[PDB]
Amino acid sequence: HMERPESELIRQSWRVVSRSPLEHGTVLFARLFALEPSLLPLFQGGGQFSSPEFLDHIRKVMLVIDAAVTNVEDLSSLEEYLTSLGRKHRAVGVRLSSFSTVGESLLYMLEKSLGPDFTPATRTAWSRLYGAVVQAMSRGWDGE
Ligand code: HEM
């Protein structure tokens, strides 16, 4: 139940991001790995000593976010998918807490993409949308 003005804040900002999703995705992940560098070895080539490739995984992440934005007014049709996606991440050793770090990284990347256009309402909207995505994913840890 996000109302139209906030929905439109999200849709407009997402269009900006969507001009260059890999570029922006790399910003998100660079911040993520600064906060939680332990995540790196999950990716192909991310270890000092099969696994997803980094840029392909960014495309995937941006496609999930894209589906969330498409469904910003009501995420209900994505719930089963998201729960499944959470299960997948759990199974490979990604802690649920790391999704909070992703959220921080997402807000960072948006701030960088948008500057003053990243209004307080836009930030709050995105926090609520992403929070809802993570809520659905969390079913995967039995950890709602
Ligand atoms: C801490 C952050 C993350 C790490 C370390 C990470 C890691 C991974 C790993 C290791 C896989 C492979 C899973 C497998 O093959 O079974 C994967 C798959 C995937 N991840 Fe992530 N992930 C992260 C966040 C995200 C987020 C936030 C999204 C979406 C919003 C996402 C979307 C995907 C998708 C769509 C797949 C493909 C799943 C499939 O094969 O069906 N990831 N991720």
Residue numbers in the entry: 0 to 48, 56 to 150
From the publication, what sentences describe this entry?
Ngb is over-expressed in hypoxic conditions and it may be involved in gas/redox sensing, radical scavenging, and/or signal transduction. Notably, hexacoordination in Ngb accounts for a peculiar structural rearrangement and complex kinetics upon ligand binding, which takes place when the distal histidine (His(E7)64), engaged in internal iron hexacoordination, dissociates from the heme. The dissociation of His64 is the rate-limiting step for ligand binding and it triggers a repositioning of the heme which slides further inside a large internal cavity.
The double conformation of the heme in 70:30 proportion, along with corresponding histidine double conformations, is present and His64(Nε)-Fe-His96(Nε) angles are unchanged with respect to WT. Besides some alternate conformations of the N- and C-termini, of the AB and EF loops, due to crystal packing changes, only the CD loop was significantly altered. The absence of Tyr44, that is not pinning any more the loop to the heme, allows the displacement of Phe49 which might explain the D-helix destabilization. Quite surprisingly, the hydrophobic cluster involved in the support of the heme, and including the canonical Phe28(B10), Phe32(B14), Phe42(CD1) and Phe61(E4) is loosened in the Gly-loop mutant. As shown, in Fig. 4D, Phe42 and Phe61 are displaced with respect to the WT Ngb phenylalanine cluster: Phe42 is located about 0.6 Å further away from the heme (Cε(Phe42)-C3 methyl(heme) distance), whereas Phe61 is laterally shifted of approximately 2.4 Å (Cζ(Phe61 wt)-Cζ(Phe61 mutant) distance).
